[PDB]
From a paper:
We used the sponge RNA 3ʹETSleuZ, which was observed in vivo in pull-downs of PNPase under conditions of induced RyhB expression. Comparison of the models for PNPase-RNA and apo-PNPase shows that both KH and S1 domains clamp onto the 3ʹETSleuZ substrate. Although density for RNA is not apparent within the active sites of the enzyme, there is visible density for three bases stacking on the three Phe77 residues at the entrance channel, where the RNA path may branch among three possible routes into the core interior. The structure of the substrate-bound enzyme in the phosphorolytic mode indicates how the flexibility of the S1 and KH domains facilitates substrate capture and how these domains clamp down on intercepted single-stranded RNA.
Polynucleotide phosphorylase (PNPase) is an ancient exoribonuclease conserved in the course of evolution and is found in species as diverse as bacteria and humans. While the catalytic core performs the phosphorolytic action, the KH and S1 domains participate in RNA substrate capture and autoregulation (Wong et al., 2013) and are powerful facilitators of PNPase activity.
Author numbering:
A (entry chain C), B (entry chain B): 1 to 695
C (entry chain A): 1 to 79
D (entry chain A): 554 to 632
RNA sequence: AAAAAAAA
């Protein structure tokens, strides 16, 4: 009835299997890809017909993590999986970036690829198996697609590269990089790193690109027998005559406008050329259409900018390939916030703020590889006034979550260990103006806001957004690229890092033939510029300050005996409630003795510090104890001796095996010399009273 | 490179700092306004071109409270981030209402104002600072706007008015009137009051209007050096002939038709005339636009009704200036809910219901100013069938939150204090028909539903909406304006109060030249009309009565030794779940020594009291129990004996000495006779295995 | 002025009361239906003119459980 | 899975150690919520079979011996 | 000893 086709190949130490034809037979193609007990089901459905008047390729990628894949019922009140998480949206972006540029030019049919995680081995991460899955699904479908891609996560254990590291190994790794490539060239790189040197990162990318050849060979083998016939699609014929007709009229004039050098006079000059040339021949036979004309005019603009940059020295803004827009940097701009800074690159402004908190306010994010609690929170706001448009604010789009993640990778490598800084820290970066690359203006600002709040950060960090143009063998690397020159970049990349060593590299490639030395000079030029930005920031704030003091929560640490803390948590743990209500202060649950005191001022902290040492008087070695007799009855005398446990006297006696009598030395409330060197009965260390006799 | 313009003046005690040019340079204007460490960043972005479909003005105002202001991590579990709520939406409406009238007629270009709170001093409210901020931003851009508007919150303490009261001052105050006004006149008033006479409320509006003069003068001085050149905008030219042709064939045949008393009959006549004029236009329609002809027709209608109302006695429905619509009031209409009332004022009809609950079910509002718990909740539901239309129902719009808040101000003045009414109270109003002013029908309904459920309100309250029509030297004040008659009103206002004293007041003004001498008669006519509604309302329910017979929750507060209550909490709340569930009533966990036994009858209250007595009590003498070994302690034990708690036999304890070494009882199934013995301070109570009677 | 018209019949040992004319007069019809102290208010609004270009029949049914019907304030954070 | 075994109604005392201290270590080491039970019907709540069998093996090991205050051929393992 | 209801 139904027969599955299975191919099994060895990637690293994990057997990986592709299963096809078994499920979802009405979708254009579908594959279950399984790698060492983690499995994801990936399916592509592509429209057969072009929706008329579409001028942008509509590609949808959906990635979703069903909780039944871990064997757990969802925590939500509904007990059902909700809207896609931040983490899931980011994984979808990782699949989309290497796929979108690989479809042929002028392909505009609707395409949707859905990846569902269906089972998870906690040790094996589902994303690197999802990327192979999308590559398999697209290459098996008839859809016009320029060859399969692999994917490989490379780590850096003990100065060795280790392909596809398992989750525990990442604890002691200094690098986590995700290469995706075809057989000809790399297509994208994403990473976080504990300040590695440049050549170690480029070495990891050249390594990962070779280990992916196994997947490329294996998907090509599967498509030989189990693939659908490629449905024939031919790009719509270009009108050579129309392109020549519009060129004679505007090419020389548009070139002249770019030769004119200004922020806005070139703009106005281009507009008068565009408006007239569009008007001319607009009414001639009614052949001209707004879509037909606008596209050719923008295409001529892109041609004159590319050709001008590869040869003519001036860029659109007039700075040379190695120059960065002017800096202006300001600290403590907001009142009554824990720490704040404004970083301006001249047309990119990031107002960024760091707020501290007690451990209670840390996030507890539950996911398939296990619940974990993180103490560093990064949020990136891109409000619509920042690019001069009007739109609904509402909730963040994928790019805001993408940029918020990349900036977090940049700073995370320089944050202090929780043992020497116990507070949770949230950084919110609010973009106020955006014409450059605003994610890298966020990293610089975040390092200022953190060290202004007086977190002991390990070093200053800064970012640079860069582009490469390689129409011919000649290439030019461009530093601090404007947003308005995205189309000019044949590759573009971001190089967030420190005075020495790189923190987070991200790189998306759109052209064939980028060999390793063309990456090497491009991020050597990136090291140059990053150092210049770092130099200006050291003059604004050289080192971290002592503390925020703007109603900053204060935390204090002290080591107390495990027995004394158990009694402060005595009566079932009720004893701790008696303290927290009196001092407005939480005491934390390290029962092995590392007491944390946390409070909103420098008094209730000190009151709690006085109270913990005051209220517990349990010592088993002890000393002569001038405690006060409460009852001198048989079965041992009762004596007031203080905190912890008040010991009862050793059995039937006062001291010396009941040499004396209860009637002898009888009064209430009297000071007597107690000592606590006895047996541990009723769960109490017993005691005795050395009154001119001794046991 | 960058330096701000800075302008600081003194408003009342605080110092206001206006700061410009430093941030968001691509928005049409942006201003950082700071008042005693509370700071809000406010920006306006306005599209220069107009969309050629718009026949209304799209102005959008967003107010948002970043919780990084005042240094705290967001409570929301998901992503530690927030979305717009009631508290923010009401502040957006307070900025919106004064700005819309000032913008010139025919200005249809889209405009967006975004106001972000970036720091809060909890003594100074952010709302007043924002209204100055939006006024500065709009007046500083070139957007055509008629003058800056200052704002002013006016408190009232020991019969002295105080400007911008701090939170500490306000709590003691008897009014909280907001006023916003240009140099010529007031433009908006919003206020709650502890039942003050009309002359005290009018005194506040004039006083606040005069203190705002400093803000208006200062904003002009800033615009004199930092301001943009005003962008040219001309109202679209109006063709007198196009208006004249429709006017000639309408006004006479509409003046007679407005005379017809029946609403449906007149509606059918005017619609027929309208179609006939459209037919008369014939070739070329009206500039080839039916809409243009319709606009002229609506205008001719508005002019005839307005001119008629201020020259002649009859209104659209044949009523005079001082005739409130026919009143039909019916209490207790719903079964098995704690209190309900249907209030019908002519066509506007409101079904209102009151429900009581335990203090536990109060909501916790995490406002930027500080966390607070309110015990009184008002919810206003406006379903689309109330208008006779079809539409969605699910999510409340801005107006439902606006009206819900105004209705809450009406009743909040007359609620009993929690220290003689220990319940949370929720009022839900369902507007079942809405021709007229629905929100003030909701206040009456709420005042009947509350005093029907038996809450002892301080007096009955009621409300009315009113309109002023004003020309070159004369004006008419109309009572109970209908929805259709709002277009003729130049001023409209709503008043809610008891037999003596205004409780809430709201005014919006659309024209200059209204004055204290007009408002003096307008509120006196309101005192007349309100005092009639109170009499009809009084007949249905004269005074608050007893509590609901059965459905209402009743509270019992039995006193228990709180250490035993703490043990009944168990491992932080695990046994009490069963106890509340088996009773099926909301018995509380409060450990203060007052156990809340809340139940819907006396039987479940007594069952719960007996259930807590079973687990808390220990028999003081009992019998010679054959106690059986239940547990191990450290050299200790727990023995089952009479009452809810086990006793301990320490191994040595049968006669205060080891007369018979007691090792043999130290195992299960021995069950040897014991007798009750003393309770010690430690909590390990004394027990001994002795047949002899022990006390 | 205003008064309902009421019909009461016995269905399966529960008295059922049909009550009309008192509320939602603006909507095309409204009928408070009650069966032994469980009560639901039901209203229908229909457009008098058919929108040109419609082919299918757009019927929308909305059922709502207000929690004030059971005497309890809501469990939701926003109340 | 929830696992349950009978262990002798005296030697059960030795499973627990002095108070909660050894219970913390055993629950932390095995990743199981093993509770204190005087009856000896020790309940070892677990999230999978591996954690259950790991907890069964350690509770078997650390209380495997009958104290009758008798003679043992006890080998000195550490001075 | 492992201590009191809060579905953002």
């Amino acid at each position: 009835m139904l027969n599955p086709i299975v191919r099994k190949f060895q990637y690293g130490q994990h057997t990986v299997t592709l299963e096809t034809g078994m499920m979802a037979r009405q979708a254009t193609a579908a594959v279950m890809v399984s790698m060492d007990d983690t499995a994801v089901f990936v399916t592509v459905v592509g429209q057969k017909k072009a929706k008329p008047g579409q001028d942008f390729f509509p590609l949808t990628v959906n990635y979703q993590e069903r909780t039944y894949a871990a064997g757990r019922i969802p925590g939500s009140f509904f007990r059902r999986e909700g809207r896609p998480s931040e983490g899931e949206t980011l994984i979808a972006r990782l699949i989309d970036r290497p796929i979108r540029p690989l479809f042929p030019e002028g392909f505009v049919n609707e395409v949707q690829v859905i990846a569902t995680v269906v089972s998870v081995n906690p040790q094996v991460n589902p994303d690197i198996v999802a990327m192979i899955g999308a590559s398999a699904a697209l290459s098996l479908s008839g859809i016009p697609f320029n060859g399969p891609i692999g994917a490989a996560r490379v780590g850096y254990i003990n100065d060795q590269y280790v392909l596809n590291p398992t989750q525990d190994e990442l604890k002691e790794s200094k690098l986590d990089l995700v290469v995706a490539g075809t057989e000809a060239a790399v297509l994208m790189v994403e990473s976080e790193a504990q300040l590695l040197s440049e050549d170690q990162m480029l070495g990891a990318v050249v390594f990962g690109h070779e280990q992916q050849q196994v997947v490329i060979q294996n998907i090509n083998e599967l498509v030989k027998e189990a693939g659908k016939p490629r449905w024939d699609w031919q790009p719509e014929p270009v009108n050579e005559a129309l392109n020549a007709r519009v060129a004679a009229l505007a090419e020389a004039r548009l070139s002249d406008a770019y030769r004119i050098t200004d922020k806005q006079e070139r703009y106005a000059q281009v507009d008068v050329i565009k408006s007239e040339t569009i008007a001319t021949l607009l009414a001639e036979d009614e052949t001209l259409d707004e879509n037909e004309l606008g596209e050719i005019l923008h295409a001529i603009e892109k041609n004159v900018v590319r050709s001008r940059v590869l040869a003519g020295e001036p860029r659109i803004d007039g700075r040379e390939k190695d120059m960065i827009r002017g800096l202006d940097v300001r600290t403590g701009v907001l009142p009554r916030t824990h720490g704040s800074a404004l970083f301006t690159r001249g047309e990119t402004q990031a107002l960024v703020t760091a707020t501290l908190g007690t451990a209670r306010d840390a996030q507890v994010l539950d996911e398939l590889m296990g619940e974990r609690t993180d103490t560093f929170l990064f949020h990136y706001n891109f409000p619509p006034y920042s690019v001069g448009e009007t739109g609904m604010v509402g909730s963040p789009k994928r790019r805001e979550i993408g940029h918020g993640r990349l900036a977090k990778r940049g700073v995370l490598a320089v944050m202090p260990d929780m043992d020497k800084f116990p507070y949770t820290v949230r950084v919110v970066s609010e973009i106020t103006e955006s014409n450059g690359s605003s994610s890298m203006a966020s990293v610089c600002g975040a390092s200022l806001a953190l060290m202004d709040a007086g977190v002991p950060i390990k070093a200053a960090v800064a970012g640079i957004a860069m582009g490469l143009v390689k129409e011919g063998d000649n290439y030019v690397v461009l530093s601090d690229i404007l947003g308005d020159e995205d189309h000019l970049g044949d590759m573009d990349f971001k190089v967030a890092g420190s005075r020495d060593g790189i923190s987070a590299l991200q790189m998306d490639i759109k052209i064939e033939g980028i060999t390793k030395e063309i990456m090497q000079v491009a991020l050597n030029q990136a090291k140059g510029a990053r150092l210049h930005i770092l130099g200006v920031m050291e003059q604004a704030i050289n080192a971290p300050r002592g503390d925020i003091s703007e109603f900053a929560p204060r935390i204090h640490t002290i080591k107390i005996n495990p027995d004394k803390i158990k009694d402060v948590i005595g009566k079932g743990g009720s004893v701790i409630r008696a303290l927290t209500e009196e001092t407005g202060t939480t005491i934390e649950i390290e029962d092995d003795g590392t007491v944390k005191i946390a409070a909103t001022d420098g008094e209730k902290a000190k009151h709690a510090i006085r109270r913990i040492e005051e209220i517990t008087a349990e010592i088993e070695v002890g000393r002569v104890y001038t405690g006060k007799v409460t009852r001198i009855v048989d079965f041992g005398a009762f004596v007031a001796i203080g905190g912890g446990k008040e010991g009862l006297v050793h059995i039937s006696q006062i001291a010396d095996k009941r040499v004396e009598k209860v009637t002898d030395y009888l009064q209430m409330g009297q000071e007597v010399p107690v000592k606590v060197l006895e047996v541990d009965r009723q769960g109490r260390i017993r005691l005795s009273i050395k009154e001119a006799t001794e046991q």
